[PDB]
TrEMBL record, chains A, B:
Its EC number is 3.6.1.23. CDD domains: NTP-PPase_dUTPase (cd11527). This is Deoxyuridine triphosphatase, putative. Ca(2+) binds at E41, E44, E69, D72. One of its GO terms (cellular component) is nucleoplasm. Pfam families: dUTPase_2 (PF08761). The keyword RNA-binding does not apply. InterPro entries: dUTPase/dCTP_pyrophosphatase. DUMP binds at Q14, N18, K52, W53, W54, D72, N186, R189, Y194, K201. GO terms for molecular function: dUTP diphosphatase activity; metal ion binding. Mg(2+) binds at E41, E44, E69, D72. Keywords: Calcium, Hydrolase, Metal-binding.
Length: 260, 260
């Protein structure tokens, strides 16, 4: 259960990113824009799995593309959350095997939606209701990502955020640490000294993404999502990124700058 | 309001097509397969519109690809309907303009899903609740196709069928007449005399799709969806196709062959 405080802090980070680019961003957007964007990225993830039962295919998805898609969904869902302040869900479970062992005699055509889980209230929903790991299994992924579309459709952005963070952990990616590292790099890229070549890397020739990876590799998801100290760990990741990219002391921001 | 009798007859036509290819097709499939397929085809339709508000794009979708996608959805939704015998919907309306004229003072961040229409029961739902025409307008299309995904997610296949038939009419395509014509051609293609070149076209050199178009061009949607006489009109379309493709009298089937 990802703390609502942590979820709110991530959304404030995203508001920061969005506000730098356009101070009036919220006025130009609607909640439905972010729902659509989530739905489209979830569809892209779905389509990379071998779901088409009538084709002779295929290789499971590229893990790097999956990570990119999860990261993209996170940006959309954090942006969505900034525009919101009983709604029932009818979730898919992973594709079932035929009824057997003497239960096949009540396996008749049922009311539409019988295969869906019992109605779950959106405000009572947890991950175990709608995400199925591991995502290496096709049917688990198909149910999970369809469920993400269901939640995006109800504008349940915090649940979507939680879900993609968990999905990322499942495939070995610490999306919270990555998000905070990349957030910092976004600010560095707008600095005069970055743009003019004054600020240089701690290791010449190493690509930005490999540098970020080095900054975040010591941290597990649990390490950066404790309700008590997450701000400190995110500040540590910020500092690590500033160091790696050669930012002078006086140009750095603390985590408290971004958090309300 | 498309008659439930007509919807059932279309689904029986589809069961016919599916049963020819695999007599045990239903045992291999689940309702969720068809929901997924619908969702993926709706996503493809969505992605062909210029929805990405951060890109300098683009030309509205290709009308022929739209027609193909609607036709594909119809096959999936008719197949879905054959596997089923209160569920709430929260539909999108087309993207709103900002609140004004002195209502802007209650435009505050609201409970998630506030922009969605009031809950509509799936069994009370009509087209006017979720489809917005014309589909030449981007925001109308985006709301409509997202709503189709909502209904596919609840396995409301008959509503999906109705919706794509109406969508097809909106862009000038009689999808019912086309479906029946193509259904007939599917059977002709499995006939010995077709496969061996014995059965020849009424006009040499004309492509199959242009021939089908000639068979169906006299019919409006209303012409082929009257509860009283639709079977007769579908039989007339079958006969027209058999004639155009050179089928001997004794190899033809009547509409009553397919309908239960």
């Amino acid at each position: 259960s990802l703390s609502p405080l942590i979820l709110r802090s991530l959304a404030e980070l995203q508001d920061g990113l969005n506000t730098v680019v356009d101070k009036n961003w919220r006025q130009l957007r609607r909640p439905g824009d972010w729902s659509l964007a989530i739905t489209m990225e979830a569809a892209e993830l779905l389509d990379s799995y071998p779901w088409k039962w009538w084709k002779n295919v295929k290789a499971q998805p590229d893990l790097q593309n999956v990570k990119i898609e999860l990261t993209d969904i996170l940006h959309f869902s954090l942006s969505g959350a900034m525009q919101v302040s009983k709604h029932w869900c009818y979730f898919d479970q992973p594709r079932a095997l035929p009824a057997a062992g003497g239960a096949e005699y009540v396996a008749c055509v049922e009311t539409p939606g019988s295969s869906l889980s019992a109605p779950v209230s959106a405000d009572e929903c947890d991950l175990a209701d709608f995400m199925f790991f591991p995502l290496s299994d096709t049917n688990n992924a198909l149910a999970s990502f369809q469920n993400i579309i269901r939640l995006a459709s109800l504008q349940r952005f915090q649940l979507v955020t939680s879900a993609v963070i968990a999905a990322a952990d499942d495939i070995g990616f610490n999306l919270v640490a990555y998000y905070v590292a990349k957030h910092t790099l976004n600010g560095i890229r707008q600095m005069k000294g970055y743009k003019d070549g004054t600020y240089v890397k701690v290791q010449k020739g190493v690509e930005d993404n490999e540098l970020l990876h080095g900054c975040i590799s010591p941290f597990s998801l649990d390490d950066v999502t404790n309700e008590g100290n997450y701000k400190t760990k995110w500040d540590d990741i910020m500092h690590r990124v500033y160091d790696a990219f050669g930012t002078p002391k006086e140009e750095r921001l603390n985590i408290g700058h971004w958090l309300k």
